[PDB]
C-alpha cells in the first residue's frame, strides 16, 4: 500500500477544536485518545485547521500525517489567540512564492496591491497619489469608526482595542484568532508565504493579517459584538461555533483563494498557472 494526497480546502470543514487528550496515529488514521482510553476518529483530511487547546499532547506521527494531507495544526492557549502552528514544509511551487516576492519588494506594485485591498475593504477605490503610510492612517481611522458603529448598532459599551498578557476585546480576539487560522491555511494551500505582507510587514503573519483584515468586518466581527452582548461565563465556544457557521454559510474557504489571487494579480504581472 502506497499513495496519499491533500484534498482541496474548498471541500473541508473550516476548523475543529481538540482538548484534554493525546492525538496519535492508529492504522494510518488520526485519533484523539482520552484518559479513560476512548478513541475518537477525526477526519483530519476533511478539515482545514485543527486547533489544539491546553492539555493536548501531539504525537510525531500525528503531525506528519496532518502535514501529508495538508492540514494546518495550530496551538491555541487559555481561550487565547494563535500561539503556534505547524504545516507543510513549504509552498508547492517556487513560481508562486517568487511572484509574491516581486509584488512585495518594489514599492509601486505594493502600492497597487494595498489600494486594491482598500477597495475590497470599503467598496470604494482609494484616493489618488497617496503613499502607503497614509492609507494605513485612513484604515486605522475607518476601523475605529467601524468598531464604534457596531458597538452603537448592538448596544455595547466600547472602550477601544485593548490587550491582555474587556469581554468585547476577548470575543474579537478569539474570532480573529480563528480567522487568522483559516487565512493562514488558505495562504499555505495556495502555496504562498504568510511572512511576506504588504500592509503589515516584518512579522511572521503579516500576509495573514493583510488578507484576514479585508473580510474581517463583513463576516466575523459583527457576531463577536453580538456574542459580547451576551455576558456568559465561557464566551469562546459560542464564538467558535458561530465562526464555523459563518465560514460555511458565507462560503469563506472557497472564496479565500480567489481573493488572494485577485489581490496579487492587481500587480499587473502574470501569475503562474495552477
Amino acid at each position: 500500500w502506497l499513495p496519499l494526497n491533500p484534498i482541496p480546502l474548498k471541500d473541508r470543514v473550516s476548523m475543529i477544536f481538540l482538548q484534554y487528550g493525546q492525538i496519535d496515529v492508529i492504522d494510518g488514521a488520526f485519533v484523539l485518545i482520552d484518559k479513560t482510553g476512548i478513541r475518537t476518529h477525526i477526519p483530519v483530511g476533511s478539515v482545514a485547521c485543527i486547533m489544539l487547546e491546553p492539555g493536548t499532547r501531539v504525537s510525531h506521527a500525528a503531525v506528519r500525517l496532518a502535514a501529508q494531507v495538508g492540514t494546518l495544526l495550530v496551538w491555541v492557549g487559555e481561550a487565547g489567540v494563535r500561539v503556534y502552528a505547524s504545516g507543510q514544509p513549504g509552498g508547492a511551487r517556487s513560481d508562486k512564492l517568487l511572484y509574491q516576492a516581486k509584488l512585495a519588494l518594489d514599492e509601486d506594485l505594493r502600492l497597487k496591491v494595498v489600494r486594491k485591498m482598500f477597495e475590497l475593504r470599503f467598496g470604494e477605490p482609494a484616493p489618488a497619489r497617496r503613499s502607503v503610510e497614509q492609507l494605513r492612517g485612513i484604515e486605522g481611522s475607518r476601523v475605529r469608526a467601524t468598531y464604534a458603529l457596531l458597538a452603537k448598532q448592538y448596544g455595547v459599551t466600547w472602550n477601544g482595542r485593548r490587550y491582555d498578557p474587556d469581554t468585547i476585546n476577548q470575543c474579537i480576539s478569539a474570532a480573529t484568532s480563528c480567522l487568522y487560522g483559516v487565512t493562514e491555511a488558505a495562504i499555505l494551500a495556495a502555496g504562498y508565504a504568510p511572512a511576506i505582507g504588504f500592509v503589515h510587514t516584518g512579522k511572521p503573519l503579516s500576509f495573514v493579517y493583510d488578507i484576514a483584515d479585508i473580510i474581517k468586518f463583513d463576516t466575523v466581527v459583527p457576531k463577536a459584538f453580538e456574542i459580547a452582548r451576551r455576558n456568559p461565563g465561557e464566551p469562546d465556544r459560542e464564538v467558535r461555533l458561530a465562526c464555523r457557521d459563518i465560514f460555511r454559510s458565507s462560503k469563506t474557504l472557497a472564496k479565500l483563494i480567489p481573493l488572494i489571487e485577485d489581490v496579487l494579480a492587481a500587480g499587473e504581472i502574470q501569475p503562474p498557472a495552477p
Partner: protein, 93 residues
C-alpha cells in the same frame, strides 16, 4: 426527498425483512434508499418499535453543516459525540 442509510446489528428477523419492504439490502444489515421526511420518520418508528436487544444507526443527507445527520437506537461501543456542534464518533473501549 433525500438519501437514507440504515445499519442494524443483532436485530430480529422481523425488522430485518421489514426494512426490506421499502429498502434495498446491499450487505448484511446495511440498507440504502431515497425517501421523504415523513417516510424516514415512519421507518424510524418501525425501528424504534422492533429493535430488541440489538442496536441500529440511521443517517441521512441534509443541507446542514456536515452535509448529513444521524441517530442511534440501543447501545453500541461506537457512539455519537459532540465537538463544538460538529457531530463525530467516539469509540468506547
Amino acid at each position: 426527498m433525500s438519501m437514507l442509510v440504515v445499519v442494524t446489528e443483532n436485530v430480529p428477523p422481523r425488522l430485518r425483512g421489514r426494512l426490506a419492504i421499502w429498502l434495498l439490502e446491499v450487505r448484511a444489515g446495511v440498507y440504502v434508499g431515497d425517501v421523504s421526511a415523513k417516510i424516514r420518520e415512519m421507518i424510524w418508528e418501525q425501528i424504534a418499535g422492533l429493535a430488541e436487544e440489538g442496536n441500529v444507526v440511521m443517517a441521512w443527507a441534509t443541507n446542514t453543516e456536515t452535509g448529513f445527520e444521524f441517530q442511534t437506537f440501543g447501545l453500541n461501543r461506537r457512539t455519537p459525540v459532540d465537538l463544538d456542534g460538529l457531530r463525530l464518533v467516539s469509540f468506547l473501549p
